[PDB]
Amino acid sequence: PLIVPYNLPLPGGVVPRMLITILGTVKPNANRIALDFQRGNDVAFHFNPRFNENNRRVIVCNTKLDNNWGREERQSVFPFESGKPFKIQVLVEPDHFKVAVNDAHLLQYNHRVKKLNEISKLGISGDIDLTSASYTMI
Ligand SMILES: CO[C@@H]1[C@@H](n2cc(-c3ccc(Cl)c(F)c3F)nn2)[C@@H](O)[C@@H](CO)O[C@@H]1Cc1cn([C@H]2COC[C@H]2F)nn1
């Protein structure tokens, strides 16, 4: 186990068939979780479960370019629960990131940042206890 925030290096960036597995437990009374796939200062893929946006649970996904957030993609399907162990898997595919939580498909996010081999860090932050962050090739 690791104390967030934590940065997982992704040397030489990501590539299709790379499967990133984040294991942890959501804190009690959690407000937010964030994964940030970074290309330098740019965020290629921000994955942001929000436990209380306007008293609703929602997943917000976005990209940050030149320090500006772009168009949000939102999902109401919300597989996280305060206090519970989770597994987030991000599968890098040729045209999107595919996310599954607890072995159930959640969403796809099309690549806005095209230079996958420069997406060289994954930030993990928010209201979690982080057990593990690793990857393999499928
Ligand atoms: C409040 O900031 C968030 C921003 N955010 C979260 C964290 C964050 C830090 C720490 C932790 Cl521990 C953690 F979980 C975290 F989510 N940092 N930045 C990120 O979620 C963003 C996603 O779109 O929305 C907000 C910023 C934003 C949204 N928009 C819209 C208007 O124009 C287009 C749209 F994009 N403009 N700016």
Give the closest residue to 99 by CA, choosing from 127, 122, 68, 128: 122
Calpha distance 79→34 (Å, rounded): 14
Give the closest residue to 97 by CA, choosing from 2, 18, 5: 18
For the chain, report the end-to-end CA distance as a whole number of angstroms: 24
List the 128-137 sheet strands across, edge first: 104-110, 96-101, 85-92, 18-26, 128-137
Secondary structure element (H or E) that encloses residue 9, with its range: strand 6-9
Ligand 1 geometric centre to CA of 62 (Å): 8
Ligand 1 geometric centre to CA of 12 (Å): 26
Q: How was this structure determined?
A: X-ray
Q: Is 47:34 a contact under the CB 8 Å cutoff?
A: yes
Give the closest residue to 61 by CA, choosing from 26, 21, 88: 88
Question: What resolution does the deposited structure have, in angstroms?
Answer: 1.2
List residues forming the annotated binding site. Answer: 69-75
Q: Domains in the chain, please, with CATH?
A: 1-138 (2.60.120.200)
Calpha distance 121→133 (Å, rounded): 12
